[PDB]
Amino acid sequence: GAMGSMERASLIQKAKLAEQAERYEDMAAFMKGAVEKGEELSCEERNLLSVAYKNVVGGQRAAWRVLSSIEQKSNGPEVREYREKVETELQGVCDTVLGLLDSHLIKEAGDAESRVFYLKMKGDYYRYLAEVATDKKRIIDSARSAYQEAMDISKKEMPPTNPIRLGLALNFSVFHYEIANSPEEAISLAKTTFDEAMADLHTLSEDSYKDSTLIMQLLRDNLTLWT
Amino acid sequence: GAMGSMERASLIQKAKLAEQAERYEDMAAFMKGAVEKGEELSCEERNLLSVAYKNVVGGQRAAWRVLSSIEQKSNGPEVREYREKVETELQGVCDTVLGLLDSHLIKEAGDAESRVFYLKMKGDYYRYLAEVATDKKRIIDSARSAYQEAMDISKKEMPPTNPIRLGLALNFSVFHYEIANSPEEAISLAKTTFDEAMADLHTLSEDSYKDSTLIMQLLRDNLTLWT
Amino acid sequence: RSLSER
Amino acid sequence: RSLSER
Ligand SMILES: N=C(N)c1cc(-c2ccccc2)c(CNC(=O)c2cccc3c2OCC3)s1
Ligand SMILES: N=C(N)c1cc(-c2ccccc2)c(CNC(=O)c2cccc3c2OCC3)s1
Ligand SMILES: N=C(N)c1cc(-c2ccccc2)c(CNC(=O)c2cccc3c2OCC3)s1
Ligand SMILES: N=C(N)c1cc(-c2ccccc2)c(CNC(=O)c2cccc3c2OCC3)s1
Ligand SMILES: N=C(N)c1cc(-c2ccccc2)c(CNC(=O)c2cccc3c2OCC3)s1
Ligand SMILES: N=C(N)c1cc(-c2ccccc2)c(CNC(=O)c2cccc3c2OCC3)s1
Ligand SMILES: [Cl-]
Ligand SMILES: [Cl-]
Numbered sequence: 001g002a003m004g005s006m007e008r009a010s011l012i013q014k015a016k017l018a019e020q021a022e023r024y025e026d027m028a029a030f031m032k033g034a035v036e037k038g039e040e041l042s043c044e045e046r047n048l049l050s051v052a053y054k055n056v057v058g059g060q061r062a063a064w065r066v067l068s069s070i071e072q073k074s075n076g077p078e079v080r081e082y083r084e085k086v087e088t089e090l091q092g093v094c095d096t097v098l099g100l101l102d103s104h105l106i107k108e109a110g111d112a113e114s115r116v117f118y119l120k121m122k123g124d125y126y127r128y129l130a131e132v133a134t135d136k137k138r139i140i141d142s143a144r145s146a147y148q149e150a151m152d153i154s155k156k157e158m159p160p161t162n163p164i165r166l167g168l169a170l171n172f173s174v175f176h177y178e179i180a181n182s183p184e185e186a187i188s189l190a191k192t193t194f195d196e197a198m199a200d201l202h203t204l205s206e207d208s209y210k211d212s213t214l215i216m217q218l219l220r221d222n223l224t225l226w227t
Numbered sequence: 228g229a230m231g232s233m234e235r236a237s238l239i240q241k242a243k244l245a246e247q248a249e250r251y252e253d254m255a256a257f258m259k260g261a262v263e264k265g266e267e268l269s270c271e272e273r274n275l276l277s278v279a280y281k282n283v284v285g286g287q288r289a290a291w292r293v294l295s296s297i298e299q300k301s302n303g304p305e306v307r308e309y310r311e312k313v314e315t316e317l318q319g320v321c322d323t324v325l326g327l328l329d330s331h332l333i334k335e336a337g338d339a340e341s342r343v344f345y346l347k348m349k350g351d352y353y354r355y356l357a358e359v360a361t362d363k364k365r366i367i368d369s370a371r372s373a374y375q376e377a378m379d380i381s382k383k384e385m386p387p388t389n390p391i392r393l394g395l396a397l398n399f400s401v402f403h404y405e406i407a408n409s410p411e412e413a414i415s416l417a418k419t420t421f422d423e424a425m426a427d428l429h430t431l432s433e434d435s436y437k438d439s440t441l442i443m444q445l446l447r448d449n450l451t452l453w454t
Numbered sequence: 455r456s457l458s459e460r
Numbered sequence: 461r462s463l464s465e466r
Contacts, residue, residue: 021290063248
């Protein structure tokens with residue numbers, strides 16, 4: 001690893017600087033290096049890892065969608081070739097993230113908050129692979145299984161307003177609607193998540209209340225689009 | 228060159244796709260490959276080259292400014308090291324662009340519109356080097372000389388509302404204000420450019436009129452900040 | 455397009 | 461900060 005010679009603390013510090021500088025590819029490289037030191041990640045460090053790769057793959061997904069739309073309309077080799085280039089790079093980033101989760105973040109996650117976070121990430125990165133897949137069936141099943149295991153743990157171990165639990169349910173609902181062709185499942189999950197969070201807000205501080213309601217707004221926004 | 232095996236037309240087509248996908252590093256690589264085919268660039272192709280590298284170096288400049296500000300406030304080695312990493316990458320991109328201009332875009336530019344465009348680019352990329360330099364004196368002189376040669380040609384060969392002439396004068400005025408510590412020169416150049424363009428608008432079509440007035444707005448905006 | 459976690 | 465060509 002190109003980051004093998006840098007101290008763990010220095011990698012984390014530089015990931016935070018890269019975030020402020022909007023240098024997300026650098027941020028992801030620093031956080032991959034930190035993960036590869038073999039120690040568990042704190043909550044803050046898990047958030048840095050997630051932000052970095054979400055931004056990298058987000059740009060790739062946005063580009064792929066533009067190119068796939070151009071390719072569909074035109075139906076020379078250039079559009080297909082360039083779409084394939086972007087697709088391959090996106091798949092490579094997803095495979096890198098999934099590799100970090102499998103070697104060895106998930107197995108070493110020795111409490112529910114960490115394990116849920118990583119299983120949610122696993123679902124997310126299989127979902128991104130599914131967006132470009134044609135197998136697609138196997139990828140969809142891997143995403144669903146990761147998300148469902150995360151949901152089972154989150155329902156036993158976290159309150160309904162916990163932001164990781166909320167974000168997991170949100171993203172699993174998106175999986176159902178956009179990937180699995182299961183819009184009824186998406187709507188049911190978003191609705192139950194929203195209602196159970198609503199009924200738990202009374203337990204929260206002003207700060208946690210703002211945290212939770214921000215994510216609940218996204219559940220509401222999807223339900224408005226889907227119904 | 229990694230693009231040596233791709234057809235020139237395919238490189239141009241892919242640069243246009245990369246622009247639509249907001250993949251500016253890819254766009255710059257495709258356009259560098261096109262330049263390295265050794266044929267002159269059309270107006271459209273010069274614009275693609277400029278857009279690509281402007282966006283790449285723009286992100287690097289924005290990151291460098293964030294990091295340099297953090298470094299100044301703190302005055303471990305991490306902030307300096309990461310600022311230096313970004314600085315080195317920015318300098319490398321500028322050196323690449325200047326290398327394309329010197330081998331051999333400028334010498335092969337066989338008319339005034341092309342030569343002015345490339346000399347303006349030369350001034351711009353030396354200006355970006357000057358922003359991070361400490362020599363700085365030599366770089367500042369190289370930028371000024373490129374800009375001044377472009378100005379001399381543009382004043383003889385282009386009307387005052389030509390958008391390349393306007394953009395050149397705008398960027399040279401920024402050079403004077405921000406780099407050369409010559410705010411009076413900046414103000415004088417912006418004012419004379421604005422007034423001479425104003426007096427030439429009557430010669431333009433509705434479309435050219437919108438082109439020219441858009442750039443004139445930036446001259447106005449700077450004069451408002453500078454006076 | 456559906457909105458995911460931000 | 462001064463504005464350059466867009
Ligand atoms: N550097 C970063 N990007 C983060 C560092 C930490 C952190 C965690 C623990 C201790 C210290 C820092 C983060 C915790 N996540 C959030 O706050 C968050 C995430 C998603 C959306 C919103 C959020 O807040 C308002 C809206 S994000
Ligand atoms: N148990 C909890 N409810 C939390 C404990 C900590 C924590 C803080 C400091 C140190 C260790 C843990 C939290 C920090 N916030 C997040 O991670 C977060 C993640 C995703 C989205 C949002 C988030 O907040 C705003 C919205 S949330
Ligand atoms: N398929 C379903 N499960 C629904 C059918 C109807 C419906 C509509 C018209 C007439 C009859 C039924 C629903 C009404 N929306 C909600 O309850 C709801 C709850 C929380 C948040 C939001 C909501 O909407 C947008 C944002 S949800
Ligand atoms: N793909 C691209 N980015 C371009 C292709 C061509 C082109 C040139 C000749 C023939 C065909 C295309 C361009 C010409 N520049 C502009 O129009 C332009 C530049 C800066 C600012 C503004 C502009 O317009 C309104 C505001 S930009
Ligand atoms: N002589 C002229 N006034 C032009 C001739 C051509 C041209 C068109 C087709 C083919 C060949 C040349 C032009 C295309 N516009 C640009 O390049 C341009 C560049 C920078 C900024 C702006 C621009 O336009 C809007 C604002 S401008
Ligand atoms: N140093 C200078 N050359 C100036 C001194 C004063 C001045 C101000 C107050 C009192 C006396 C003089 C100037 C007045 N601004 C202009 O003419 C002008 C012309 C075109 C466009 C813009 C302009 O302003 C903002 C945008 S310019
Ligand atoms: Cl390609
Ligand atoms: Cl570094």
